[PDB]
Amino acid sequence: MIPDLVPVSLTPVTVVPNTVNTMTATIENQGNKDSTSFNVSLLVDGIVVDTQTVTSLESENSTNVDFHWTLDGTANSYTLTVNVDPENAVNEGNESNNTLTALVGTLEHHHHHH
Secondary structure: OOOOEEEEEEEOOEEOOOOEEEEEEEEEEOOOOOEOOEEEEEEEOOEEEEEEEEOOEOEOOEEEEEEEEEOOOOOOEEEEEEEEOOOOOOOOOOHHHOEEEEEEEEOOOOOOOO
């Protein structure tokens, strides 16, 4: 009986460099134990741009974590890593399950030119 906090997806996978992109990390607790409050941080290539602690994550239920990331335009590819509680306050199931390393690109279609 252990919370297996798994960051499943990070949408959108391609981001518009026009605004502060409220991205949605879908964290699903794929373990049969309801998890308590946990700090989900967005690590861009290692740096922590934003941290949003979630109230709770139920067993086999998913929570939508909204990140507050201002697109810098520093790169065309960002290595967004959703590390579910890097402090391991809630000891998760599998070691590599609490992290999500996914490349997000800059969206070709922009809502605004610049």
